[PDB]
Design a protein around this ligand. Structure first.
Ligand code: HEM
Ligand SMILES: N#C/C(=C1/SC[C@@H](c2ccccc2Cl)S1)n1ccnc1
Ligand SMILES: O=C(O)Cc1ccccc1Nc1c(Cl)cccc1Cl
Length: 402
């Protein structure tokens, strides 16, 4: 008996770090902006598979980001960890979203990010010093890809780096969590740590965004103590995990396209455009597109009903051939403009300027300090994270000329 389905299972896992899963490429090819899918618990939902329609729906206020809504398209049991506690502004709609987000934007401006350039370079070259002095073979993730953005975001947040082993482990346990209880345990571990950090700042006013939020908004009752915890946790995990994944996958991808890597090294003028193309191509946050319709939405003849879950899959939208000619080809020289790796609209990634800065610095540093860098194993031996979480590899064995 045939098993062809109208709503295939979603999400799907990558088999190649920089290629869509086979199922996603099928969704990309099927005409129309929408397609039905079956989530892990049997409920059906819509997935958006085209670029301009993704922009349109991301800007549509009728698609809500409220993750506490019972009809929100949860794609894994671990998603329950964020549903039970107060929502950081990633899970808020206007006007609450803007009031909370504006409490944090000062630390992510173009002026502040450019101001952080010397300390980002210092942290990058510091962890490179330690890795190269230790010699190959090293795991690029635990020795460079993860600690670099961890240290940077901690200094931005005011989180003491001396506790890094604790909250890096709690962050990883949440990222890789495959059940609800494990995710909630790792989340409460972070919540308990951040709550004590708040009390510490109330005794002794401190630096970083968390200290600012404690001294001002919390003391004026304009943010709840548990919203501060959720917001700080969002920035902490995002600061750690997204950049680390872009680093490891950019290294894997660039080494599989050695002509473009050598061209990139020969001209650092190309690093900014190469970073945009890597963001479009790798789209490591393609699971973070969930929305729920609060009213009927008709999309090019197809009707989204109120109460239906919608998932804007930015990896698929970033492979729209009508926007990026030959979209499945990595081209660091192409115009990667208007890609959706960071989203679009009111929720577009607050840390996008920081991720762009860190990746540029990291890529330039790897080409300067370790040009003989190469993988210590075939990419087929690398272990990919599933489509239910942030795209990445659990470890990246690398070697170089000692
Ligand atoms: C290459 C790295 C990153 C990628 C690919 C990425 C991707 C995304 C995407 C697709 C969204 C949209 C979520 C939605 O529409 O529901 C988002 C939002 C967000 N990201 Fe990132 N992100 C990255 C790095 C970071 C970093 C380093 C931070 C540090 C704080 C961060 C913090 C946030 C926040 C706070 C939001 C929510 C903004 C809002 O709701 O107004 N991200 N990100
Ligand atoms: N990547 C990423 C990222 C995420 S927030 C929501 C996360 C998520 C949503 C739904 C299901 C599973 C997961 Cl894990 S993924 N982020 C955070 C800041 N900027 C980007
Ligand atoms: O979304 C959040 O509030 C925290 C956060 C920040 C960065 C990356 C992921 C997550 N959340 C998250 C995690 Cl770490 C695991 C499973 C499901 C979710 Cl929603």
């Amino acid at each position: 008996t045939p098993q062809t389905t109208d709503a295939p299972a979603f999400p799907s896992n990558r088999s190649c770090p920089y290629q869509l899963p086979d199922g996603y490429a099928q969704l990309r090819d099927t005409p129309g902006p929408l397609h039905r899918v079956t989530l892990y618990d049997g409920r059906q939902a819509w997935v958006v598979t085209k670029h301009e329609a993704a922009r349109k729906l991301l800007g549509d206020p009728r698609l809500s980001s409220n993750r506490t809504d019972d009809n929100f398209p949860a794609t894994s049991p671990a998603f329950e960890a964020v549903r039970e506690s107060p929502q950081a502004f990633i899970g808020l709609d206007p006007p609450e979203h803007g009031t909370r987000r504006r409490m944090t934007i000062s630390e992510f401006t173009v002026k502040r990010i450019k101001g952080m350039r010397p300390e980002v370079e210092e942290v990058v070259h510091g962890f490179l010093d330690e890795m190269l002095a230790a010699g190959p073979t090293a795991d690029l993730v635990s020795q460079f890809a993860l600690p670099v953005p961890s240290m940077v975001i901690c200094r931005l947040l005011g989180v003491p780096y001396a506790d890094h082993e604790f909250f890096q482990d709690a962050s990883k346990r949440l990222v890789q969590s495959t059940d609800a209880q494990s995710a909630l345990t790792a989340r409460n571990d972070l919540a308990g740590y951040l709550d004590g950090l708040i009390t510490q700042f109330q005794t002794e006013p401190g630096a970083g965004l968390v200290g600012a939020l404690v001294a001002d908004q919390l003391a004026n009752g304009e943010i709840d103590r548990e919203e501060l915890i959720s917001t700080a946790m969002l920035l902490l995990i995002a600061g750690h995990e997204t950049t680390a994944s872009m680093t490891s996958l950019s290294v894997i991808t660039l080494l599989d396209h050695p002509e473009q890597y050598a061209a990139l090294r020969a001209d650092r003028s190309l690093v900014p455009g190469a970073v945009e193309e890597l963001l479009r191509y790798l789209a490591i946050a393609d699971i973070a597109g969930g929305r729920v319709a609060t009213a009927d939405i008709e999309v090019e003849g197809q009707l989204i009903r109120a109460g239906e879950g919608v998932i804007v899959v930015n990896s698929i939208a970033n492979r729209d051939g009508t926007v990026y000619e030959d979209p499945d080809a990595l081209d660091i020289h192409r115009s990667a403009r208007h890609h959706l790796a960071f989203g679009f609209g009111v929720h577009q990634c607050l840390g996008q300027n920081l991720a762009r800065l860190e990746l540029e610095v990291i890529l330039n540093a790897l080409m300067d300090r370790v040009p003989t860098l190469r993988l210590a194993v075939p990419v087929e031996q690398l272990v990919l994270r599933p489509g239910t979480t942030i795209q990445g590899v659990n470890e990246l064995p690398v070697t170089w000329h000692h």
